[PDB]
A paper describes a structure:
The product template (PT) domains act as an aldol cyclase to control the regiospecific aldol cyclization of the extremely reactive poly-β-ketone intermediate assembled by an iterative type I polyketide synthases (PKSs). Here, we confirm that [name] PT domain functions as an aldol cyclase to catalyze C2–C7 cyclization in OSA synthesis by comparing the products generated by [name] and its mutants. Crystal structure of the bacterial PT domain closely resembles dehydrase (DH) domains of modular type I PKSs in the overall fold, dimerization interface and His-Asp catalytic dyad organization, but is significantly different from PTs of fungal iterative type I PKSs.
The protein crystallized in space group P21 with two independent monomers per asymmetric unit. The structure was solved to 2.0-Å resolution through selenomethionine incorporation and SAD phasing. Each monomer comprises a DHD fold of DH domains, characterized by a continuous antiparallel β-sheet curving around two α-helices (αHD1 from the N-terminal and αHD2 from the C-terminal hotdog folds). The C-terminal hotdog (residues 1056-1174) possesses an additional helix (αC) comparted to the N-terminal hotdog (residues 915-1032). These two hotdogs are connected by a 23-residue-long flexible linker containing two short helices (αL1 and αL2). The two monomers in the asymmetric unit dimerize through N-terminal β strands and bury a surface area of 665 Å2 (calculated by PDBe PISA). The dimer interface of [name] PT is dominated by hydrophobic interactions and hydrogen bonds. The H949 is from the cap loop of the N-terminal hotdog and the D1104 from the helix αHD2 of the C-terminal hotdog. The Nδ of H949 forms a hydrogen bond with the backbone carbonyl oxygen of I956, suggesting that Nε may be used as a basic nitrogen to deprotonate the substrate. The D1104 is 5 Å from the H949 and the D1104A mutant shows a slightly decreased production of OSA, indicating that the D1104 of [name] PT may be involved in catalysis indirectly.
Residue numbers in the entry:
A (entry chain A): 915 to 1174
B (entry chain B): 915 to 945, 951 to 1054, 1070 to 1174
The structure:
């Protein structure tokens, strides 16, 4: 209910390794809603992100994430054991079949990994939203926003956010987002990563994020935000995001979201 | 090896760390009044086995025994192999109300490639040269014969259980403090520089124990079969 997959802390004697263990099934999903491909429930990338943020910052101040790879999706179907590992500046999320007498130590599958780093908050604060006029952002019809947002991502969302306004240009979107749950960054991160693939031009494809070069968050999540999402002009299948609060102060950035 | 504290293997994703977990209880001993103490020999064979999970056999070096493994009821045991370092720890049995009690590290050692040609080149000190006059047991071993000199003993030991090295190692580490001159004190080993074992334990053995002439509170041991072929050595047993 923290929106993370961090369960019971575990230690290795004589080692600064940090572990957390948990069991995942359909009745212990750390998020409220459903995130599913035709009845295939997949843990949202936002949950992986906040899990890594929490694991990074446990005995310390908050971290940014770098080179977050999401190689294999985490499914909720049946029952699986989850291990989150912090080893130095590396965090990993793994799962395996629930151990039993016949297989008391099944091998781990590593789903995702990132590196933790000191957040670049002056970098973050020096960002601002692209100028609407300069990039010719036209306000979009609510009905088409809903259809587009549905088309490019998984039909329902994991979390309680919504788009109250959206302006769109060529490979740029500005979305005014409501996010009443401020108990974690997962809802806003889920909004960013659900809205981001709407920026791609051409025919709508269903995409899922598999990599992020950098995730930086600052402070507690606001309940109203503007989410900017912009195509990388040079590298395919890549989007960059900025989140500001209602007064336009930058509160999160996600660089190099990859949606192949 | 039947006398180790190695329980269920466990792993850390993305790491070559090896873990084993077990619960230690008076009902299921792998080998005072209401308190139980794990013999040093059990710690040694645990570390030998943890060292040699992939490989065939390791020697141990710099085995330190800091806190005895004591139990009056139930305790969780963790054995850790991290590269060439092995550690043994214990804690109160976790539950939902206390889900991650802290580990107490009892002992540690380093693993290394056993020097078996070195071991085979050892032999028992000459009885005549050292003027040997012929004169706890939680396991099944016993001393059937003993010759003693100044700071040296040769003890013929019977050890019917050959399912592990723990009984013979326990005999060595129990008989070694007898090598100290002067009035008998109870001593218990807290450090060993090197432990090397080869093959399966014999059921009859001779144990040599000799004071280090130069360093205080230190004893060296050699274990041979009945024909004097070396099967184990323990160098630098420290008994403060």
């Amino acid at each position: 209910d923290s929106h993370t997959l961090l369960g019971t802390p575990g230690g290795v004697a004589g080692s600064d390794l940090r572990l957390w263990h948990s069991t995942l099934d359909d009745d212990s999903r750390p998020y409220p809603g459903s995130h599913a491909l035709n009845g295939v429930e997949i843990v949202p990338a936002a949950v992986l992100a906040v899990t890594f943020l929490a694991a990074g910052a446990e005995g310390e101040e908050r971290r940014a994430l770098q080179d977050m790879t999401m190689t294999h999706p985490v499914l909720t179907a049946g029952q699986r054991q989850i291990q989150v590992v912090r080893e130095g500046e590396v965090v990993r999320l793994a799962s395996r079949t629930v151990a039993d007498a016949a297989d008391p130590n099944p091998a781990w599958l590593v789903h995702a990994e990132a590196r933790t780093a000191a957040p670049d908050l002056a970098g973050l604060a020096a960002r601002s939203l692209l100028d609407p006029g300069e990039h010719r952002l036209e306000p979009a019809d609510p009905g088409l926003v809903s259809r587009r947002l549905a088309e490019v991502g998984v039909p329902s969302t994991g979390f309680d956010w919504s788009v109250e306004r959206l302006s769109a240009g060529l490979g740029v979107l500005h979305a005014q987002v409501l996010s009443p749950d401020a108990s974690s960054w997962a809802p806003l991160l889920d909004a960013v990563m659900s809205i981001a693939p709407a920026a791609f031009v051409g025919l709508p494809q269903l995409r899922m994020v598999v990599h992020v070069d950098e995730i930086t968050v600052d402070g507690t999540p606001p309940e109203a935000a503007t989410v900017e999402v912009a195509l990388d002009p040079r590298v395919a299948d890549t989007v960059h995001a900025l989140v500001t609060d209602g007064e336009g102060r930058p509160v999160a950035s996600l660089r190099g979201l990859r949606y192949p």
